[PDB]
């Protein structure tokens, strides 16, 4: 009948290396559903004007972490028919990094946030971060 699917929605800071127009980290409104990440400039522009969307299934997920430096970065390496796209996500705190990273790591494997091991994945990441500090 009625079902409910989990999503992530928040503002993240994003950098795109190989976009040959100059642009560093911008705060965008970013939404994660199923195994696809979509980022937008503004909330009003959600959901049907995607500045960028990408299916993370099959991609490389590179953690880029320095807890003492308040660096919570996720590097997504997405293959394409014309080479690799890179998408760098910077989160605001440890909780946000844990949710967003758990989601990216599962999605890379084709598993969604509905998979029963997503919660233990978040909590596992939080533990990781908390013990480094």
Contact 125, 93 (CB under 8 A): no
Token pair in block for residue 120: 């233990």
Burial of 107 (0-12, 13-18, 19+ CB in 10 A): buried
Round to whole Å and give the CA distance between 115 and 14: 26
CATH no. for residue 100? 2.30.29.30
Query: Which whole-number Å values give the CA distances from 3 to 6, 116, 125, in the listed order?
Result: 10, 16, 28
- Experimentally, how was this structure solved? X-ray
Q: How many domains does the chain have?
A: 1
* Domain span at 47: 1-133
Resolution (A): 2.2
Is 61 buried (19+), middle (13-18) or exposed (0-12) by CB count in 10 A?
middle
Report the candidate in 13, 15, 35 with the shortest Cα–Cα distance to residue 85: 15
| Alpha carbon distances (Å) from 56 to 33, 110, 126, 131 | 10, 8, 22, 28
86 bridge partner residues: 77
């Amino acid at each position: 009948s009625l079902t409910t699917i989990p999503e992530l929605k928040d503002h993240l800071r994003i950098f795109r290396p190989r976009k040959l127009t100059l642009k560093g980290y911008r705060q965008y409104w970013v939404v994660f559903k199923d195994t696809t990440l979509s980022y937008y400039k503004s909330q009003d522009e959600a959901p049907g004007d995607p500045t960028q969307q990408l299916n993370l299934k099959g991609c490389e997920v590179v953690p880029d972490v320095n807890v003492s430096g308040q660096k919570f970065c996720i590097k997504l390496l997405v293959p394409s028919p014309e080479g690799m796209s890179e998408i760098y996500l910077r989160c605001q705190d440890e909780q946000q990094y844990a949710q967003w990273m758990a989601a990216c790591r599962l999605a890379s494997k084709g598993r969604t946030m509905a998979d029963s091991s997503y919660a233990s994945e978040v909590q596992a990441i939080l533990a990781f971060l908390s013990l480094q500090r």
